[PDB]
Structure 1
Amino acid sequence: RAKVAMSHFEPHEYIRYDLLEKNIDIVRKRLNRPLTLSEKIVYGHLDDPANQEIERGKTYLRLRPDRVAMQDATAQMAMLQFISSGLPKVAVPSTIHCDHLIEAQLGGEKDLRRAKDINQEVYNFLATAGAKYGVGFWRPGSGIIHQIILENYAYPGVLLIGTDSHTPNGGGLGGICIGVGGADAVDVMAGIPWELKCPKVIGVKLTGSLSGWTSPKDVILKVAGILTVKGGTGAIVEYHGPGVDSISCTGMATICNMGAEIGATTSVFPYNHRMKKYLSKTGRADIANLADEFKDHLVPDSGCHYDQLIEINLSELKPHINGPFTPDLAHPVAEVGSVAEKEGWPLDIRVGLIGSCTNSSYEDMGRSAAVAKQALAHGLKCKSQFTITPGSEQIRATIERDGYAQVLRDVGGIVLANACGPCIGQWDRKDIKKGEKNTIVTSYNRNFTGRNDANPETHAFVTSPEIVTALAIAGTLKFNPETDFLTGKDGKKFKLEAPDADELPRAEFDPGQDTYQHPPKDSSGQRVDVSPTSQRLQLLEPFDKWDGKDLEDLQILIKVKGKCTTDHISAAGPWLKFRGHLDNISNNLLIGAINSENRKANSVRNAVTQEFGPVPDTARYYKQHGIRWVVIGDENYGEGSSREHRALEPRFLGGRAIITKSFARIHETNLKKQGLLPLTFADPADYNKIHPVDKLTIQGLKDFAPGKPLTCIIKHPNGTQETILLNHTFNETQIEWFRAGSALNRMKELQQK
């Protein structure tokens, strides 16, 4: 066909639209119905399109992703498990991005230099394992994973998996980009088919066009409010309609990115002329030309069916700000000042933070600079503290060159290193004490309790970068940039004009400094060294195989009440230090979950000693004494970030099963991967039949089968027993993971020994 390379760093790996077309055509001859865009890309990547059972919401698809991307907080454990597989080289184009371990303290260069010294052991390990297994390495300072992927690796029609739940960002360039745990990335790096439950498809038809203060962020702040955080579970969100040509390519990436907050499998936009324009300005005009020739396969079929349709008229949409402790609590900016007042949310904004991969594009920085130049023209500067995170080195070098960084510095902003920083709590925040109630507004995406600064009483609101800038200048939520007046230096009242700015640089992007490290694909004789006394890295010891018996008289470690995110199960911030060390990071296990017994965090009753104490310590006491335990959870258990540490930590400390009303997708997959039993109540009311003191027996593991429920005997202290039924979503492939003790153990059994 054409021999067009997948990226500038892999000149030999060609885009296979011929394969994609061939597979779409085998499948549509079988289904004889129009296919949505996500169906064309996903089914076009099936391992076996002639025989695969295809039913939305029901069958597991065996897929062949084109590439794997990892960020350094999840890459360490993905690579420790790849190292246990014993396999010599990764099977597909794979990259590591070092963006999660650079703490914000002093700003830019200073924080990067400190991070490189503090994290040397870990950056060393990743660069060395990268050179040895043939994984490309983007050095600390290079940029945030999703911005480097949009700029270099995402293209129309790619199926990409990343060990990070905001991998959907890549949907802004017409690709299917899906968040997974590190063990799923090991399947694909090992060359074995990746499995994904066939998604439902929610269509969102966009009408009209954006005007004035409304930006692409408002489309997904509005959708999250409509769908709620559990509304997109098990579905891909597919944006379509005449209003799509009104959104820049980075804007589409913004909207696809935050679809992670409604639990969606991923989001996607159809190939159009805004993507073509972005591909040509990022050195990939040959890929835009090839996608023009396969354009029919990169847009939805006429008359395709969506399982749910939502319509949004971009011309009526007005600025939104969401939170404070969930991303789906939506408010127009115009009314948040009055709702805050009512609910007792601090009206004064201590810190305004722009950037992160969600909103650090050249157009986002240009629009924020446009608001900032107006304030400057009246002698004002920010009343709140103000920080700016560039998404990549190329964006930092280009906004520096075109003068936007200096405008943002002149209004009082501090430019932070090109890294997650305050977005996952890597922020040395000193202006408030812990427990001090305060408000910060961000252009980020998640705004859950204690995530930006480990203070549970910080009220974080997510909005667009131009609104964070307007509100940072005002210093209060009780300011609506569309209506209200500011007072300059000179005494005159003035109103902020709506920001206008170029979406892409008129000149080319300035690539900034050299940050990519290609693997020697020659040499590769590296020795990965993990010191046996390291506190940051530890090689894995395999988990135990199943004993062949039912699980009797299980102790409940904790029955959790309400929301239980993976930041409640395995907190980030300070614990990022131990992401490559399973025993040390297991000391945060479930310390944020609320115990229904006393409604406290990290305070559970030890059944033997009858002392209330920390959840980690109690689980290690049960493990030490041979007591197998269970977690009982509520709805959407495991919501959030993809970190497989939330599944590895309960396995390591002696847990056996997690029984909930429902699971978020990535966490449920991660639990199955590590040999635990994620089970749901066949009747959710049965959550109330189980009390912390009850013991449980799960029966029927001997004839464990797809679609057959498991029986659970609740043993009450007084001698009463109640039998209830538990559903599970295991197919046969996955029951083999459970019988072997984990998916990695099963893979190593298939290597003939």
Structure 2
Amino acid sequence: RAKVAMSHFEPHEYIRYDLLEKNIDIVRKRLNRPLTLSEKIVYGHLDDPANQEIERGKTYLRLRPDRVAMQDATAQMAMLQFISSGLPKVAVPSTIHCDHLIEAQLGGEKDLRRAKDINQEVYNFLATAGAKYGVGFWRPGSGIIHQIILENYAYPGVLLIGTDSHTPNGGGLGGICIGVGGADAVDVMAGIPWELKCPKVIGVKLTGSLSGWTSPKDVILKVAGILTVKGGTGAIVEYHGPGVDSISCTGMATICNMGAEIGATTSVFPYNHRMKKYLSKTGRADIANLADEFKDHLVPDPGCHYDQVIEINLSELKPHINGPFTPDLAHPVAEVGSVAEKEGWPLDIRVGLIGSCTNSSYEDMGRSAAVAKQALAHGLKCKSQFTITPGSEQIRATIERDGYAQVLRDVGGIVLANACGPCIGQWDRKDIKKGEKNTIVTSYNRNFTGRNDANPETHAFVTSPEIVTALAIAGTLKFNPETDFLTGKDGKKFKLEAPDADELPRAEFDPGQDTYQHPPKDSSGQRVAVSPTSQRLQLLEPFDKWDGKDLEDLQILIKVKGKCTTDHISAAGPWLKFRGHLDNISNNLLIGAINIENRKANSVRNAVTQEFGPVPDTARYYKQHGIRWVVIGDENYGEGASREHSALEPRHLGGRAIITKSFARIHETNLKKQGLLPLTFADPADYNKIHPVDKLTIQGLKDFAPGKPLKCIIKHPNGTQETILLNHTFNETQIEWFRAGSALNRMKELQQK
């Protein structure tokens, strides 16, 4: 038995490939078929491999993740619910990463120093909560959670859960990394089996090879166009084929990462020599050697069946740019000029933003600087404003030394801190007035409405960072780097050649500024105090328990039309300063959702006063008057970010049930965790039989059972009524979260009482 540590920070915690193999063998003895790669790693992590019922797309798997990671905008509510379980330390290796509260304003350390003084209370809280419960802490400036995870923590066959959507990024290193809400991470840190609905598996076969301007990003921008934002729901995306071996480890992380934008449970690549070179370049040669020895369990079984198969010829794939308000509106960079002209999107690119998490590696920085260096050899600088986020302090230190940062700086770039920044709206913008219509190209992944700067006329197009650079040098959406014009002030030769770059540093990486903090061995006398008067941090008052009765005469707060992401339910940006305080953050509840009645964001009819106004105020009026309510939603309600606040905030403001045509995975788990009832129309046309005025009775809660539909009476103002049926995906574990008022109350009644 090998004793290879999980990371450089937990030398006493070994990789368990013998347990994985042990459990894969038990499960294929029961299933008697080839297993996909994701099936190998997921079923190899089952708590009961001998007795787990296993069926893709319908069974709930009780899993034992190897580690947990949180970022600081979702770590706050996850550790208040861990505090509340009153466990003295966490059960598996866990980390907090301080990357979401650093606002981009001046660049680099002006901004970082600013964020340390502005978010001192929260960073203190998380640092002393981590020292006490045994959670590793990555300080402000360390880097974006996924980038530190890929560098330090992801390895082949790991099962990692993270309180973030883009945790799937770690699949570029052959692990299964799945985003969850804080209350799931609390389960695994507390020692509870993590339950996951058995994924269906999409195979993406890659043939050929990536060439010239076409980069990793374009493979997932293509797949997202192909499959749409809803197409990966309840499935893990598995890349296979001849062309996989043409992709660097960090470009495999890029493809796995944006898979979140099709709603996939996660995405993964098979262990290969590009993962082995990346493990060795990051000081984890021993993990690559161990994985080689278990490679059979870290690739798919020959002949495994994918439920859906898509083919992408890498060699004929050419550059993409997606948007403007959904990540699945895919355009080749060549036709994006002509189609923006046609559709009424600005061709002027105000700001080009490279980096942030999907695309912030040393290869992304080398390819961006290779474009920028050419512009510079012709005495050119950017016509658009340009920002660069390094993915981690290691990448910042290594590209500084290898000179990429000075080239990016010299074409007019501002290197921002190693933090999300612009990506979740931690950006103090300035170049446009409020409501100005503008374009911005970014190498991020999401381009939801007003996500970046809190302005809706902002058309955000996502693409590769080398395309963001060249298009920032050009200033317009009608420049296609592959064919077109350059001048310089020398007057000469027009064309930007294909940005060649170094995959990894040819010397060793430079680590930089010292950013990690170990939990002390004996943490006796770590008080983690939360001020009772703090406006940033507040303890969670347990939600009420279910009174045993049905839900009669529910008022509709809002019937939502169309696309309703977690950014519509609970916006980020200025709202991240309250992510530790549920009553203050509940003031953004569904302010961005579109009301079907008037098609306005944030004005719904108050049913008592008949005055239209803000959705949070109306919810608070109903709660204070004892009027219970529901949201009626359309398709894939709760798409996007994993923030469990989307679920905590309707519960806190008096909500009882959300009834939709369908839900995104993670938000539906969170609504069940907080004691709400996520329900779906058995017939989605029934959405049209429910009008804003109608009162709803959900009946037969007293017989709430797995697989049994609930009925709903739609009581029309005029005395007619009609009964429809509502489906749910609750199992008995989850029904007992409902009955107890939340999964936290259910844990608390199990701890004696």
Using structure 2 for the length normalisation, give the TM-score: 1.00
CA distance in 2, matches of 1:333, 1:682: 41
CA distance in 1, matches of 2:381, 2:613: 48
Check conservation: 1:107, 1:416, Cα contact below 8 A. yes
Deviation of 1:87 after TM superposition, in Å, equals: 1.0
Q: Deviations over 1:657-683 (max 9, x none)?
A: 000000000000000000000000010
CA distance in 2, matches of 1:151, 1:365: 16
Secondary structure of residue in 1 paired with 2:461: strand
Q: Deviations over 1:379-424 (max 9, x none)?
A: 0000000000000000000000000000000000000000000000
Secondary structure of residue in 2 paired with 1:494: coil
CA distance in 2, matches of 1:739, 1:669: 15
Check conservation: 1:712, 1:723, Cα contact below 8 A. yes
Distance 1:300 1:107, change over 3 A: same
CA distance in 1, matches of 2:535, 2:458: 31
Secondary structure of residue in 1 paired with 2:315: coil
Deviation of 1:710 after TM superposition, in Å, equals: 0.4
Q: Deviations over 1:133-173 (max 9, x none)?
A: 00000000000000000000000000000000000000000
Deviation of 1:232 after TM superposition, in Å, equals: 0.2
Secondary structure of residue in 2 paired with 1:450: coil
Deviation of 1:525 after TM superposition, in Å, equals: 2.0
Q: Deviations over 1:267-294 (max 9, x none)?
A: 0000000000000000000000000000
CA distance in 2, matches of 1:387, 1:443: 11
Check conservation: 1:486, 1:494, Cα contact below 8 A. yes
* Alignment of structure 1 residues 276-295 onto 2, 5 Å: 276-295=276-295
Q: Deviations over 1:575-623 (max 9, x none)?
A: 0000000000000000000111111111011100111111110100000
Deviation of 1:205 after TM superposition, in Å, equals: 0.5
Aligned to 1:529: 529
Secondary structure of residue in 2 paired with 1:137: strand
RMSD of aligned residue pairs (Cα, Å): 0.5
Aligned to 1:728: 728
Check conservation: 1:206, 1:244, Cα contact below 8 A. yes
Q: Percent identity?
A: 99
CA distance in 2, matches of 1:502, 1:168: 24
Q: Deviations over 1:104-151 (max 9, x none)?
A: 000000000000000000000000000000000000000000000000
Secondary structure of residue in 1 paired with 2:525: coil
Check conservation: 1:679, 1:726, Cα contact below 8 A. yes
CA distance in 2, matches of 1:579, 1:647: 13
CA distance in 2, matches of 1:34, 1:561: 43
Aligned to 1:219: 219
Deviation of 1:524 after TM superposition, in Å, equals: 4.0
* Alignment of structure 1 residues 152-163 onto 2, 5 Å: 152-163=152-163
Deviation of 1:433 after TM superposition, in Å, equals: 1.1
* 1:668 and 2:665 are equivalent in the alignment: no
Aligned length: 753
CA distance in 2, matches of 1:363, 1:682: 48
- Flag structure 2 segments of 5+ consecutive residues without an equivalent: none
Check conservation: 1:445, 1:462, Cα contact below 8 A. yes
CA distance in 2, matches of 1:620, 1:532: 22
Secondary structure of residue in 2 paired with 1:486: coil
Secondary structure of residue in 2 paired with 1:321: strand
Distance 1:474 1:12, change over 3 A: same
CA distance in 1, matches of 2:2, 2:629: 56
CA distance in 2, matches of 1:678, 1:313: 40
Deviation of 1:246 after TM superposition, in Å, equals: 0.3
CA distance in 2, matches of 1:199, 1:396: 37
Secondary structure of residue in 1 paired with 2:353: strand
Q: Deviations over 1:511-544 (max 9, x none)?
A: 1011000000223421011111110010011001
Deviation of 1:493 after TM superposition, in Å, equals: 3.7
* Alignment of structure 1 residues 369-380 onto 2, 5 Å: 369-380=369-380
Distance 1:650 1:492, change over 3 A: same
Deviation of 1:548 after TM superposition, in Å, equals: 0.3
CA distance in 2, matches of 1:613, 1:423: 29
Using structure 1 for the length normalisation, give the TM-score: 1.00
Moved more, 622-631 or 492-501: 492-501
- Flag structure 1 segments of 5+ consecutive residues without an equivalent: none
CA distance in 2, matches of 1:586, 1:453: 20
Deviation of 1:704 after TM superposition, in Å, equals: 0.3
CA distance in 2, matches of 1:728, 1:637: 14
Deviation of 1:450 after TM superposition, in Å, equals: 0.2
Secondary structure of residue in 2 paired with 1:286: helix
Q: Deviations over 1:702-743 (max 9, x none)?
A: 010000000101111110010000000000100000000000
Q: Deviations over 1:323-362 (max 9, x none)?
A: 0000000000000000000001100100000001100100
Secondary structure of residue in 1 paired with 2:712: strand
CA distance in 1, matches of 2:64, 2:168: 17
Aligned to 1:710: 710
CA distance in 1, matches of 2:540, 2:414: 41
Check conservation: 1:536, 1:577, Cα contact below 8 A. yes
CA distance in 2, matches of 1:77, 1:649: 12
Distance 1:174 1:524, change over 3 A: farther
Secondary structure of residue in 2 paired with 1:659: strand
CA distance in 2, matches of 1:375, 1:594: 44
CA distance in 2, matches of 1:122, 1:232: 35
CA distance in 2, matches of 1:610, 1:306: 53
CA distance in 1, matches of 2:309, 2:704: 37
CA distance in 2, matches of 1:684, 1:130: 45
Q: Which runs of 4+ in 1 moved over 6 A?
A: none
Deviation of 1:432 after TM superposition, in Å, equals: 0.5
CA distance in 2, matches of 1:105, 1:488: 30
Check conservation: 1:201, 1:306, Cα contact below 8 A. yes
CA distance in 2, matches of 1:186, 1:107: 35
CA distance in 1, matches of 2:690, 2:261: 30
CA distance in 2, matches of 1:36, 1:63: 17
Q: Deviations over 1:469-523 (max 9, x none)?
A: 0000000011000000111111124200101111000000001011000000223
Deviation of 1:321 after TM superposition, in Å, equals: 0.4
Aligned to 2:743: 743
CA distance in 1, matches of 2:602, 2:413: 37
CA distance in 1, matches of 2:483, 2:37: 40
Secondary structure of residue in 1 paired with 2:651: helix
Check conservation: 1:217, 1:254, Cα contact below 8 A. yes
Deviation of 1:569 after TM superposition, in Å, equals: 0.2
Secondary structure of residue in 1 paired with 2:657: strand
CA distance in 2, matches of 1:491, 1:276: 46
Check conservation: 1:740, 1:746, Cα contact below 8 A. yes
Check conservation: 1:349, 1:384, Cα contact below 8 A. yes
CA distance in 1, matches of 2:691, 2:118: 45
Aligned to 1:345: 345
Distance 1:524 1:282, change over 3 A: farther
Check conservation: 1:134, 1:524, Cα contact below 8 A. no
CA distance in 2, matches of 1:523, 1:257: 36
Deviation of 1:310 after TM superposition, in Å, equals: 0.5
Aligned to 2:443: 443
Q: Deviations over 1:174-221 (max 9, x none)?
A: 000000000000000000100000000000000000110000000000
Check conservation: 1:102, 1:115, Cα contact below 8 A. yes
Check conservation: 1:131, 1:524, Cα contact below 8 A. no
Deviation of 1:86 after TM superposition, in Å, equals: 1.1
Check conservation: 1:370, 1:500, Cα contact below 8 A. yes
Secondary structure of residue in 2 paired with 1:495: coil
* Alignment of structure 1 residues 249-648 onto 2, 5 Å: 249-648=249-648
Secondary structure of residue in 2 paired with 1:487: coil
Secondary structure of residue in 1 paired with 2:77: helix
Check conservation: 1:356, 1:423, Cα contact below 8 A. yes
Check conservation: 1:133, 1:524, Cα contact below 8 A. no
CA distance in 1, matches of 2:102, 2:747: 34
Check conservation: 1:159, 1:177, Cα contact below 8 A. yes
Deviation of 1:20 after TM superposition, in Å, equals: 0.2
